[PDB]
Amino acid sequence: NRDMPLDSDVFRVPPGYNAPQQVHITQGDLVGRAMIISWVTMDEPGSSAVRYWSEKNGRKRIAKGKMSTYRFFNYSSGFIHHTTIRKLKYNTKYYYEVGLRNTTRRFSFITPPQTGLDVPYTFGLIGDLGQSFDSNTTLSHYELSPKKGQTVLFVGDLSYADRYPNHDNVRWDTWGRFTERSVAYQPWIWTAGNHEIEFAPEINETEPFKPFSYRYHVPYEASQSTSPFWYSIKRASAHIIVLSSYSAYGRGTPQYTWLKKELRKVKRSETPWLIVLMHSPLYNSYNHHFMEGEAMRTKFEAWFVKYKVDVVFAGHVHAYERSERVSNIAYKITNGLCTPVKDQSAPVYITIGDAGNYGVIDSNMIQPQPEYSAFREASFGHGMFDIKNRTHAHFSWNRNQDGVAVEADSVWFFNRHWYPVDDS
Amino acid sequence: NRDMPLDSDVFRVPPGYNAPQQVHITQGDLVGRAMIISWVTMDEPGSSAVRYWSEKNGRKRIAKGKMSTYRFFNYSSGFIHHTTIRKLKYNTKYYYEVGLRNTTRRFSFITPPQTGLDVPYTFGLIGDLGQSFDSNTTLSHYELSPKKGQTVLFVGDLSYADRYPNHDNVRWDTWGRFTERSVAYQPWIWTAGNHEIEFAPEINETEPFKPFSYRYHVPYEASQSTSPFWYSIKRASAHIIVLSSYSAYGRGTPQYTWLKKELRKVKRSETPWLIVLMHSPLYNSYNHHFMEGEAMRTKFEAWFVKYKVDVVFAGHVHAYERSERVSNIAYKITNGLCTPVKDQSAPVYITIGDAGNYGVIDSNMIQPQPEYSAFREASFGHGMFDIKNRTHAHFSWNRNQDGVAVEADSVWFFNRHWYPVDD
Amino acid sequence: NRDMPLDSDVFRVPPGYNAPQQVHITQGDLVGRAMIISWVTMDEPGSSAVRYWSEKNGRKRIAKGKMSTYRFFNYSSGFIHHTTIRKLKYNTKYYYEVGLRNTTRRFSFITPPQTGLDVPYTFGLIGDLGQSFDSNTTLSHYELSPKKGQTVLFVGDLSYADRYPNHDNVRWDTWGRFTERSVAYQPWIWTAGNHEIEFAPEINETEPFKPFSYRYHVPYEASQSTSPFWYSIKRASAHIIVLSSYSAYGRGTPQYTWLKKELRKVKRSETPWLIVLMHSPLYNSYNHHFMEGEAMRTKFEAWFVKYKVDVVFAGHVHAYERSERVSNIAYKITNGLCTPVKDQSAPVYITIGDAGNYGVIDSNMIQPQPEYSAFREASFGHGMFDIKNRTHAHFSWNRNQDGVAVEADSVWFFNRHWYPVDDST
Amino acid sequence: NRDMPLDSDVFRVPPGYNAPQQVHITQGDLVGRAMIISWVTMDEPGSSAVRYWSEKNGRKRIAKGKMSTYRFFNYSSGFIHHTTIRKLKYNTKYYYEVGLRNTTRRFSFITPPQTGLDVPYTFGLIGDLGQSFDSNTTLSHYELSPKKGQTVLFVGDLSYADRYPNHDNVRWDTWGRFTERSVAYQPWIWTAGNHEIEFAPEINETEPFKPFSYRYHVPYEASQSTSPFWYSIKRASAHIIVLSSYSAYGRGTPQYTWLKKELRKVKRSETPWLIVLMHSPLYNSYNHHFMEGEAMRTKFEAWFVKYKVDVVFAGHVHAYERSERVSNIAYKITNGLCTPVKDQSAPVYITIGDAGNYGVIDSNMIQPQPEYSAFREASFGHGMFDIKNRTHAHFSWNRNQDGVAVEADSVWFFNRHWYPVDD
Ligand SMILES: *[C@@H]1O[C@H](CO)[C@@H](O[C@@H]2O[C@H](CO)[C@@H](O)[C@H](O)[C@H]2NC(C)=O)[C@H](O[C@@H]2O[C@@H](C)[C@@H](O)[C@@H](O)[C@@H]2O)[C@H]1NC(C)=O
Ligand SMILES: *[C@@H]1O[C@H](CO)[C@@H](O[C@@H]2O[C@H](CO)[C@@H](O)[C@H](O)[C@H]2NC(C)=O)[C@H](O[C@@H]2O[C@@H](C)[C@@H](O)[C@@H](O)[C@@H]2O)[C@H]1NC(C)=O
Ligand SMILES: *[C@@H]1O[C@H](CO)[C@@H](O[C@@H]2O[C@H](CO)[C@@H](O)[C@H](O)[C@H]2NC(C)=O)[C@H](O[C@@H]2O[C@@H](C)[C@@H](O)[C@@H](O)[C@@H]2O)[C@H]1NC(C)=O
Ligand SMILES: *[C@@H]1O[C@H](CO)[C@@H](O[C@@H]2O[C@H](CO)[C@@H](O)[C@H](O)[C@H]2NC(C)=O)[C@H](O[C@@H]2O[C@@H](C)[C@@H](O)[C@@H](O)[C@@H]2O)[C@H]1NC(C)=O
Ligand SMILES: *[C@@H]1O[C@H](CO)[C@@H](O)[C@H](O)[C@H]1NC(C)=O
Ligand SMILES: *[C@@H]1O[C@H](CO)[C@@H](O)[C@H](O)[C@H]1NC(C)=O
Ligand SMILES: *[C@@H]1O[C@H](CO)[C@@H](O)[C@H](O)[C@H]1NC(C)=O
Ligand SMILES: *[C@@H]1O[C@H](CO)[C@@H](O)[C@H](O)[C@H]1NC(C)=O
Ligand SMILES: *[C@@H]1O[C@H](CO)[C@@H](O)[C@H](O)[C@H]1NC(C)=O
Ligand SMILES: *[C@@H]1O[C@H](CO)[C@@H](O)[C@H](O)[C@H]1NC(C)=O
Ligand SMILES: *[C@@H]1O[C@H](CO)[C@@H](O)[C@H](O)[C@H]1NC(C)=O
Ligand SMILES: *[C@@H]1O[C@H](CO)[C@@H](O)[C@H](O)[C@H]1NC(C)=O
Ligand SMILES: *[C@@H]1O[C@H](CO)[C@@H](O)[C@H](O)[C@H]1NC(C)=O
Ligand SMILES: *[C@@H]1O[C@H](CO)[C@@H](O)[C@H](O)[C@H]1NC(C)=O
Ligand SMILES: [Cl-]
Ligand SMILES: [Fe+3]
Ligand SMILES: [Fe+3]
Ligand SMILES: [Fe+3]
Ligand SMILES: [Fe+3]
Ligand code: NA
Ligand code: NA
Ligand SMILES: [Zn+2]
Ligand SMILES: [Zn+2]
Ligand SMILES: [Zn+2]
Ligand SMILES: [Zn+2]
Numbered sequence A: 001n002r003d004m005p006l007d008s009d010v011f012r013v014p015p016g017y018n019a020p021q022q023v024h025i026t027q028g029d030l031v032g033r034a035m036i037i038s039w040v041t042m043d044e045p046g047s048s049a050v051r052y053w054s055e056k057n058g059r060k061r062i063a064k065g066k067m068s069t070y071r072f073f074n075y076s077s078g079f080i081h082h083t084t085i086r087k088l089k090y091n092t093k094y095y096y097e098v099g100l101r102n103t104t105r106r107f108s109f110i111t112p113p114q115t116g117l118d119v120p121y122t123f124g125l126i127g128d129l130g131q132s133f134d135s136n137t138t139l140s141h142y143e144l145s146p147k148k149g150q151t152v153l154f155v156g157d158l159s160y161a162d163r164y165p166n167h168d169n170v171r172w173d174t175w176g177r178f179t180e181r182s183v184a185y186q187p188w189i190w191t192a193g194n195h196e197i198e199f200a201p202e203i204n205e206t207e208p209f210k211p212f213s214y215r216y217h218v219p220y221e222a223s224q225s226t227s228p229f230w231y232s233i234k235r236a237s238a239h240i241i242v243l244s245s246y247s248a249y250g251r252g253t254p255q256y257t258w259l260k261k262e263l264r265k266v267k268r269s270e271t272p273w274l275i276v277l278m279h280s281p282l283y284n285s286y287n288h289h290f291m292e293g294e295a296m297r298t299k300f301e302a303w304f305v306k307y308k309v310d311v312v313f314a315g316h317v318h319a320y321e322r323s324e325r326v327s328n329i330a331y332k333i334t335n336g337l338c339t340p341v342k343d344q345s346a347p348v349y350i351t352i353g354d355a356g357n358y359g360v361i362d363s364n365m366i367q368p369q370p371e372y373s374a375f376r377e378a379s380f381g382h383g384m385f386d387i388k389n390r391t392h393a394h395f396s397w398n399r400n401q402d403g404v405a406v407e408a409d410s411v412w413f414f415n416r417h418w419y420p421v422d423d424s
Numbered sequence B, D: 001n002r003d004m005p006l007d008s009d010v011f012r013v014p015p016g017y018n019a020p021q022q023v024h025i026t027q028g029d030l031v032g033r034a035m036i037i038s039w040v041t042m043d044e045p046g047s048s049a050v051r052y053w054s055e056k057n058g059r060k061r062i063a064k065g066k067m068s069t070y071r072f073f074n075y076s077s078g079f080i081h082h083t084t085i086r087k088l089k090y091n092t093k094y095y096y097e098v099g100l101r102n103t104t105r106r107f108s109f110i111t112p113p114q115t116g117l118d119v120p121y122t123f124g125l126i127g128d129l130g131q132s133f134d135s136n137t138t139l140s141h142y143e144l145s146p147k148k149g150q151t152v153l154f155v156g157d158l159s160y161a162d163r164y165p166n167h168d169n170v171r172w173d174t175w176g177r178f179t180e181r182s183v184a185y186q187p188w189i190w191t192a193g194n195h196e197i198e199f200a201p202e203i204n205e206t207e208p209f210k211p212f213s214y215r216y217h218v219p220y221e222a223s224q225s226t227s228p229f230w231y232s233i234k235r236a237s238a239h240i241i242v243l244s245s246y247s248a249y250g251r252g253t254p255q256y257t258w259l260k261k262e263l264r265k266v267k268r269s270e271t272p273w274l275i276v277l278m279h280s281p282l283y284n285s286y287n288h289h290f291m292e293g294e295a296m297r298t299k300f301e302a303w304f305v306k307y308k309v310d311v312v313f314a315g316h317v318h319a320y321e322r323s324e325r326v327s328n329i330a331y332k333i334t335n336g337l338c339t340p341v342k343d344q345s346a347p348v349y350i351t352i353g354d355a356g357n358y359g360v361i362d363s364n365m366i367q368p369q370p371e372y373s374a375f376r377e378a379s380f381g382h383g384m385f386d387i388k389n390r391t392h393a394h395f396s397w398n399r400n401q402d403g404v405a406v407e408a409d410s411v412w413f414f415n416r417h418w419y420p421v422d423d
Numbered sequence C: 001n002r003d004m005p006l007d008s009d010v011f012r013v014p015p016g017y018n019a020p021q022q023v024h025i026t027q028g029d030l031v032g033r034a035m036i037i038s039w040v041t042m043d044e045p046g047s048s049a050v051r052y053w054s055e056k057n058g059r060k061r062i063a064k065g066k067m068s069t070y071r072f073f074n075y076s077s078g079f080i081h082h083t084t085i086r087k088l089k090y091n092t093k094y095y096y097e098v099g100l101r102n103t104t105r106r107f108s109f110i111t112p113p114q115t116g117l118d119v120p121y122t123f124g125l126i127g128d129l130g131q132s133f134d135s136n137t138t139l140s141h142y143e144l145s146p147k148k149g150q151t152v153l154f155v156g157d158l159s160y161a162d163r164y165p166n167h168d169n170v171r172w173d174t175w176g177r178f179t180e181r182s183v184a185y186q187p188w189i190w191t192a193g194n195h196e197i198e199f200a201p202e203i204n205e206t207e208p209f210k211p212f213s214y215r216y217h218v219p220y221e222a223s224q225s226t227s228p229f230w231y232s233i234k235r236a237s238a239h240i241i242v243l244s245s246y247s248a249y250g251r252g253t254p255q256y257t258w259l260k261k262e263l264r265k266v267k268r269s270e271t272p273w274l275i276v277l278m279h280s281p282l283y284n285s286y287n288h289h290f291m292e293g294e295a296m297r298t299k300f301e302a303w304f305v306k307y308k309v310d311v312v313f314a315g316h317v318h319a320y321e322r323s324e325r326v327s328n329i330a331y332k333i334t335n336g337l338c339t340p341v342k343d344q345s346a347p348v349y350i351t352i353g354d355a356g357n358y359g360v361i362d363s364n365m366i367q368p369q370p371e372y373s374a375f376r377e378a379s380f381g382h383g384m385f386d387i388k389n390r391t392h393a394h395f396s397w398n399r400n401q402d403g404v405a406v407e408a409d410s411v412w413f414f415n416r417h418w419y420p421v422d423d424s425t
Helices: A131-143 A170-183 A210-215 A253-263 A296-308 B132-144 B169-181 B210-215 B254-264 B292-304 C133-144 C170-183 C210-215 C253-264 C294-306 D133-143 D171-184 D208-215 D254-264 D294-306
Strands: A021-027 A035-041 A049-053 A061-064 A064-069 A079-083 A094-098 A106-110 A121-126 A149-154 A186-190 A233-234 A239-242 A271-275 A310-313 A320-323 A348-352 A371-379 A383-389 A390-400 A409-414 B020-025 B035-042 B050-053 B059-062 B067-068 B078-083 B093-098 B103-111 B121-126 B151-156 B188-190 B231-235 B238-242 B273-277 B309-316 B321-322 B348-352 B373-377 B381-387 B392-400 B409-414 C021-027 C035-041 C049-054 C059-065 C067-069 C078-086 C093-098 C107-109 C121-126 C150-153 C188-190 C232-237 C238-242 C273-277 C311-314 C319-323 C350-352 C372-379 C381-387 C392-399 C409-414 D021-027 D035-041 D050-054 D061-063 D067-068 D079-085 D093-098 D103-108 D122-128 D151-154 D188-190 D231-236 D236-240 D272-275 D311-314 D320-323 D346-352 D373-377 D382-386 D392-399 D409-414
Touching: A021 A106, A021 A186, A021 B273, A035 A094, A049 A079, A061 A079, A079 C107, A079 C210, A121 A348, A131 A170, A131 A383, A149 A271, A170 B188, A170 D035, A170 D392, A186 A239, A233 D122, A239 A253, A239 B254, A253 C078, A253 D093, A296 B292, A310 B409, A320 A390, A320 A409, A348 A383, A348 A390, B020 B169, B020 B188, B035 B093, B050 B078, B059 D272, B078 B093, B121 B132, B121 B348, B132 B169, B132 B381, B151 B273, B151 D122, B169 B188, B169 D272, B188 B238, B254 B292, B254 D320, B309 B381, B309 D346, B321 B392, B321 B409, B348 B381, B373 B409, C021 C107, C021 C170, C021 C188, C035 C093, C049 C078, C059 C078, C078 C093, C121 C133, C121 C350, C121 C372, C133 C381, C150 C273, C170 C188, C170 C210, C188 C238, C238 C253, C253 C294, C294 D294, C319 C392, C372 C409, C372 D231, D021 D103, D021 D188, D021 D409, D050 D079, D061 D079, D079 D093, D093 D254, D122 D346, D133 D171, D151 D272, D171 D208, D231 D409, D236 D254, D320 D392, D346 D382, D373 D409
Parallel strands: A121 A149, A149 A186, A239 A271, A271 A310, A310 A348, B121 B151, B151 B188, B238 B273, B273 B309, B309 B348, C121 C150, C150 C188, C238 C273, C273 C311, C311 C350, D122 D151, D151 D188, D236 D272, D272 D311, D311 D346
Antiparallel strands: A021 A035, A035 A079, A049 A061, A049 A094, A064 A079, A094 A106, A121 A383, A233 A239, A320 A348, A320 A371, A383 A390, A390 A409, B020 B035, B035 B078, B050 B059, B050 B093, B067 B078, B093 B103, B121 B381, B231 B238, B321 B348, B321 B373, B381 B392, B392 B409, C021 C035, C035 C078, C049 C059, C049 C093, C067 C078, C093 C107, C121 C381, C232 C238, C319 C350, C319 C372, C381 C392, C392 C409, D021 D035, D035 D079, D050 D061, D050 D093, D067 D079, D093 D103, D122 D382, D231 D236, D320 D346, D320 D373, D382 D392, D392 D409
16 A cells, blocks of 8 residues: 555645635536636535636625535545636636635636637646555646646546545545645546445445545536536537446436437537547556456447547556557447457547556556557556647656656647548 | 327226226245235325235235325326235235225235245246237237246336327326236336436436336345346246346446346355346347447356356347357457357347337348347247246247247257256 | 305416416515516426516516425425516516416516615505405405505415315415416515415325415525514515414524514614514404414514514404504513503504405404404405605505495504604594 | 533443443333334444343344434534334333444333323423533432432423534533433433524524434324424323423414314323423423413413313423412403412422523522412422322422432322312
């Protein structure tokens, strides 16, 4: 176990009575004019109000949100606040304060630009963060990146609190305080991983995702989803679809039905970059969780080809892997066509679940490297998906053992819709 | 299309003030000593009490249940009752009556024999019933069967009420009154199909399986399931595992985790017949819904082989198919091994979703007939799985266009644990 | 049984698919800038959106509210909509529309003037309305009154649906359609009466006021009440306090606590007319329900004197009665001081529970008329509290058997804070 | 504030992992064959099962109950268990054990005799107990009483936790542990006082009686009450009626309606002693809370007289008072009949809210002592209602300053139905 001890500086509780902690934000709407503000108070319920103001207009406003609590076995939570700030200005720095009654803590964010064809934007890519010492340097590598991530795409497995006895939910609080130094100033877009399931019938905890869902809200109604575990957002030139690997996705189910309709609503003339997130990779040549993505892949892979998804990000495997553009959609049971082929309409599949978890890397690879795998390496690190314009985005991967400006893997993406050419 | 009109005889309301209607029973425990009695009253809530007594020891006892209601868009249900009778005697006729506060109605059932290695038992197989005129013929054929079925293994898609505007839930009620003449007297073991999902955010109805789960209860806690849409029961010599094609089944999910534990609890020296029910077939050589079952197959086929499941029954496809014993579990992305192969540890996959639905048959088939497919036909009908003992179970398929004693398809199942020979 | 039959013209369903019916409004805030819009759709849920605009300007805005439903025994409601229009302009005609998805119906209201010392306003007084032919006559008299009532103060007992078998809640829907012609255009201020309680444990209905509270919302949180059945509103120059005779009011209970603080908040220099609404009369010389008000009188009478309430309106008794300014607050169990005395600091107690109910008047009164009873008469009718300014309000009582313009009883009120001179007739 | 400090011995936590604390029992049915067993586990949910057996026959049985939790402002409760043991034998000592899964604790109780005309029984009377050092003394005097109480009638105001900042509900847990040494072995019959209202809108606690209602269950369903704050039990020769001073009692309200019908069910030929419990006294000659009972009095006094209630116990005033048998029911507003008069159908009204509370006594009395007041004294203490038979019960008031066998006041109650003479 390489988890940071409870006394670590990154887990420190902010001073002052009922001081807000575990502050975290995410996009609150479909197009970027809104922000969910989230924090926890531990001494008393406190106010769910958020004071905020833009640098441009300097008028202090109040939004009012809602508080909630939960229990998990013998654990009882602090007071969890979720407040949505709406009708924000584009491309604008706002300041926001939480804890208006007790002790007040102040933060800030920048709204993205209005969606558009050539609007540039830099996405962090982080998966399977955890709270090990490895997790802490990955976060450091992200925040010190000269490419300056503006939003993190998070592909599942947050706190790993379920590894503890009875899923010791204090390790959710520590994770929230630890990640605050980033997510309180820029949105993370949440994907549900398997360590969020927390299905523990032995301790009478049988509602999947219960802790995760109380602590991390997503703007899922903004895209007509009926569940927080699959949803869409638009931000700058990107359309991002979040799927749930451990929800139902059979034909006719809510997630299947929502994805079918959502892929049809995508307007590549406004958001050229089509990004999909799921926890479990559909392409993966590591031994760890080899072929667990087969189920979802059979259901959705053809749809990713059809709609010319640019890239699919996943975690789950604790390592890094970048596919070639391939598909394996010709199979008809008896026709023998079960080998992935090069398909220039396919997305690139990237496994980036290597941000540290609890300190274990997945090293065992199937050998030789299969044709469908382009690059892979068992190192800790994080990714950046730097969109330049409608045709070009630059993806890079940074290792924890390198300098923060070093790119150990690096490739240009040519947009599938606006410039379809062999970017290999 | 061919759905029976609302004024059909099969849909008649039982007379009397608040007379119970849509009466139906199913196994109430793990081993067959309990029964869930269910019904609906339309005039007022009424009593959830059930009076019962055996034709033998004859003492009249009272079980008490719970009532509940639901709404669906602009539909308001009647008052739905579910009551469990426990501690029944094995292998005895009981009488039970419902509607004690006002109009009483009386029915009977016969508890199964205790579970055991060599206990014979006869299972009706019905899928995708619906309420078309074909639906009624299938049910007649089952009731007039010389085989004499004792329990219906129902592989999902019940009322087809979702085909109607706003899913007109009156068509649940009619289907309940139509099927009463069978399921009030012998258990139907319920599987959930895609027509039970009734996901309709356009009318703000977003809870999967809501009308079905209010109306049809299952003993799912008896097998430590956390959900009614997957569960297991034992009856005579059969261990029946019911799965939910339209719930989560990824690694670490409730259903995945439950099934993974459940197969370890199977004792073939106590129940040698291992039967799996699911709505969507894992092997299906018809064009309609072709390869829909692939996702669940990747997850569960290797377990079915590991545990030598005798048969997997499914509906969904509106036709009849019986596979060979095959598996397709050796694939590894790049090893190229993606062809089903004869495997005597594997189950036979039977598609039996041809009870009538709303009158339509699935006739277009993959050509040529793949080697994994033993027999297929686009006719309405039903199946019977007739366990003779620990080694032999006779499966027969009866067509609606045939006489009720006629088996258009017939095959001996040799038990995968006690007698695993080529069948 | 003088209840109007089900096929009466007043119970007619508004035509068109899923047309909104039982449209009714009431004040939706403390000061008058808000309105709660309420209505029922029978065919499908429909939209809880309200389109509205000022006759002056004309900008057509939308307010979104919520739909709820209930069951009561073997009855199932339609789809009940409550939507609050906020931030409105004072003294201004607004039009509003409901049923925006399918069949639209349009109505209007006038927001009250801004609260102030001399702001005039006419309040109607109706209690125990019911749905009888007498009930129809009272409503007609109210709306045809030459002094135009601008808001109804309603002292409880609405539909008398609970008199029917299984409280046949269909009789709630008919009463909503019948009263629509008034309450859809001007707010009625709701008090909960004993016929709202609907405690029917024999048919497993044990939640008091369940039908009433689903159908009739009030802005109780605006006055920091925690319950719909007691709350305060301010309108024009009146501060109106609504109490619940059939809720707890023992010392330390929520209603007791709320009323205690609420009287401290009243400012007679911003709203001179202090009005109390309750169902059960504290002072009542009628035989029916004689002394049922003693328990609440015991708890609150002295507070009404202390804070110089101008008038207490009640119903419950199916007749009309106006009291002298009278108090009975000096009793100490053993001191013999149990008789009401003239007290110019006390309010007037008015029983106005004679709008019709199910067609029965309460005529058996105690004789001779006690010294505390000013005027009493067993006839169907309604009242008007016509505030002229900070010092003067005219109260009048109109009988059904009389013309619409004739006051059978009437009296000038001298405001207890601004003109505290004896005004005894 | 004479409240005991948190490290006092009476607040000791039972040792051992998840040891049940705050164990307390009350009658679980109408007549005395059932017991509600309540306790709190702090380390994890634990099992709600209760193992119990009579000292007579060691046939160990299991009763299964229910667990609940609550929050109050920034306080989070432990795991609260309520389990009803039903179908017990009369007049029988039972053992019971809680904390089965982890640390077990064992207690006992003795069921009352079957209800009956001439069954003797001793009732402890305790009100406004709290947790001062005075409170601990009163509880000692009760448990040391030579008259040996068999059940406590508790007229309300339990923990006084609502005097602490934010009603510091730890002072509920501490009170449960302190009272356990009595109430784990014999029932206390709970009346809600005003310190149970805990209506605190400032800190967003607006639901009356929430902490109390979670921690202390009552068998209110057994008398067809729809609310735990009013209810009746029958025990030995007593029919006991608990009213809620701080709920609704206007005409038509649930409580009012309930009391009207419950009195009609009283059978003095089976329970000759008719006893009413309420928190706020209807007769009180103390300055503190003078005439707060008038409102309930105007509604209910004539009913008490009409049904010849033997005695009404209240608390609320932190002193002792015993009235004469008087009524004040002749008043008609204008007839001037407002003075209480002696009335041999009226109950005796006893204020017994002097068990200690937070260490304050109410000493200021109305002078001179009114005619309706028989005896009254501002001292801490408790009472005992000792039923001998259908005609006689002995009531005694024991002060904390006297020795445990000393009665500072004592009267014979002559049964209003069987023996109504001037007592
Ligand atoms: C969209 O972004 C691309 C990456 O930044 C642009 O390509 C870049 O163009 C630069 C000239 O402005 C040149 O120095 C860079 O080397 C080049 N980078 C790459 C990776 O090609 C692209 O510009 C167009 O496409 C390239 C290939 C050249 O033909 C440019 O002259 C073109 O303008 C950007 N597209 C647009 C429309 O600006
Ligand atoms: C289990 O049931 C099978 C079907 O009823 C039995 O096989 C049948 O046995 C009949 C005589 O008992 C024979 O006429 C049938 O032809 C035969 N049916 C088939 C499909 O083979 C079976 O009986 C045992 O197995 C058969 C093959 C013979 O060897 C019998 O002598 C055996 O008793 C039943 N198994 C047992 C263990 O009884
Ligand atoms: C406040 O309203 C009162 C009721 O309308 C006014 O009294 C009425 O004044 C009328 C002409 O102003 C007069 O014809 C009415 O007889 C009289 N009504 C009564 C019941 O007295 C009152 O006007 C002031 O007071 C009265 C007594 C007259 O002296 C008026 O001339 C006064 O202006 C209104 N108060 C004010 C300040 O206007
Ligand atoms: C009910 O209990 C009372 C208290 O014990 C009985 O009165 C007591 O009877 C004793 C004789 O056994 C006697 O020594 C006690 O002094 C006397 N105590 C009092 C306070 O009176 C009572 O006994 C009957 O009633 C009284 C009025 C006498 O007439 C006795 O002689 C009677 O036996 C008991 N009543 C019954 C019906 O048992
Ligand atoms: C985590 O990293 C930050 C930034 O590099 C550093 O200040 C902090 O001390 C580190 N803490 C631990 C426990 O590694
Ligand atoms: C609740 O708040 C009080 C005062 O703010 C504090 O002293 C106490 O420790 C808190 N209790 C809990 C359980 O947080
Ligand atoms: C359904 O089948 C039964 C039995 O064959 C028959 O009596 C009945 O008339 C049929 N009803 C319809 C509508 O086909
Ligand atoms: C409810 O029950 C009453 C009494 O039998 C009956 O008259 C009425 O029609 C019923 N209403 C409904 C909607 O079932
Ligand atoms: C239904 O049964 C109850 C209880 O026996 C009875 O009171 C009632 O009148 C019955 N209803 C009808 C319509 O017969
Ligand atoms: C539900 O709506 C349809 C029209 O959309 C109507 O025909 C049907 O009768 C409605 N059902 C009820 C119970 O109102
Ligand atoms: C009600 O309106 C909706 C949307 O405008 C429409 O789809 C529906 O057909 C309408 N219903 C009827 C009965 O006209
Ligand atoms: C009710 O009164 C109105 C007049 O205001 C009249 O038009 C209508 O016919 C009356 N209806 C009944 C049933 O009395
Ligand atoms: C939960 O149970 C474990 C069991 O060892 C214990 O150590 C832990 O302190 C408990 N947590 C709480 C908050 O009681
Ligand atoms: C309470 O009383 C008991 C018995 O008299 C005694 O043993 C105990 O120490 C006392 N505790 C306190 C804190 O007074
Ligand atoms: Cl009181
Ligand atoms: Fe992981
Ligand atoms: Fe089907
Ligand atoms: Fe009335
Ligand atoms: Fe007290
Ligand atoms: Na599927
Ligand atoms: Na998976
Ligand atoms: Zn994972
Ligand atoms: Zn299907
Ligand atoms: Zn009334
Ligand atoms: Zn008290």
